[PDB]
């Protein structure tokens, strides 16, 4: 009983607890790495979609002025004003970069 | 971009397996202690002389030379681990500086 209570009960069981503790810590750390990668992916996706929207806003006025061309009028105030709109749109987009 | 991921992937595994070999080492040392004092345990077939000459072997050979050699080998493992991690960190800087250097010129 001295061997049973000094060897296993004195040194082995706390070593088991220590190994278990390292397992817990590594588990927690890797789960944190997973949670970080989640944030990364979702932020990247949002960053892309927002830029897609911003581009399509310019594309709208672009195609609009393109069909405003085919009146065969270079003096159409609609066409001039849509051009003014597109200029300021491009200025505000470039100022963002 | 492929090797850019391969670098980090090997790096994390390196950092994990360093501590995992460290744990293996500490599980190994006390095993060798138990084996040494158990080999020194059954030397009681002689009188009191055979006891102390057995513990003399256990306390002079393993306790005197083997364990510091284990510590020295562990130290070399630590140093190489640190050096290789530094090499990884340097390669990171290299890749990112190259990418920035390219993109700036693209803009220009």
């Amino acid at each position: 009983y001295s061997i049973a209570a000094g060897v296993v009960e004195g040194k082995l069981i706390p070593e088991l607890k220590n190994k278990l503790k390292s397992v817990q810590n590594f588990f927690t750390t890797l789960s944190n790495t997973v949670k970080q990668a989640n944030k990364d992916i979702d932020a990247a996706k949002l960053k892309l979609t927002t830029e897609i929207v911003a581009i399509g806003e310019i594309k709208t006025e672009t195609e609009t002025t393109r069909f405003y061309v085919d009146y065969d009028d270079l003096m159409l105030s609609l066409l001039k004003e849509a051009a003014k709109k597109m200029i300021n749109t491009c200025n505000e987009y470039q100022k963002r970069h | 971009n492929n090797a850019s991921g391969k670098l980090l992937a090997l790096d994390s595994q390196l950092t994990n397996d360093f501590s995992e070999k460290s744990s293996y080492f500490q599980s190994q040392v006390d095993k060798i202690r138990k084996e040494a004092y158990a080999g020194a345990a059954a030397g009681v077939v002689a009188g009191p002389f055979g006891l102390i000459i057995s513990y003399s072997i256990a306390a002079g050979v393993v306790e005197g030379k083997l364990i510091p050699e284990l510590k020295n080998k562990l130290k070399s493992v630590q140093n190489f681990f640190t050096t290789l991690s530094n090499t990884v960190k340097q390669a990171n800087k290299d890749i990112d500086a190259a990418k920035l250097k390219l993109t700036t010129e693209i803009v220009a």
């Binding site: 190994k19 | 991921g5 992937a9």
Partner: protein, 54 residues
């Protein structure tokens, strides 16, 4: 009285758990990092092309 065989085999299984999970995890993490850099590059090209047109 010291089940050291069973002790060591337990430690083996315990370590083998973490080996397998590190092995499975870090590869996929590196795949993520690659895709992140690729999307970054695509983004840079697209924005650059737009700006240069504008």
């Amino acid at each position: 009285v010291i089940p050291w065989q069973t002790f060591d085999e337990t430690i083996k299984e315990l370590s083998r758990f973490k080996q397998e999970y590190s092995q499975a995890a870090s590869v996929l993490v590196g795949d993520i990092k690659t895709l992140l850099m690729d999307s970054q590059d695509k983004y840079f090209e697209a924005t650059q092309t737009v700006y240069e047109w504008c």
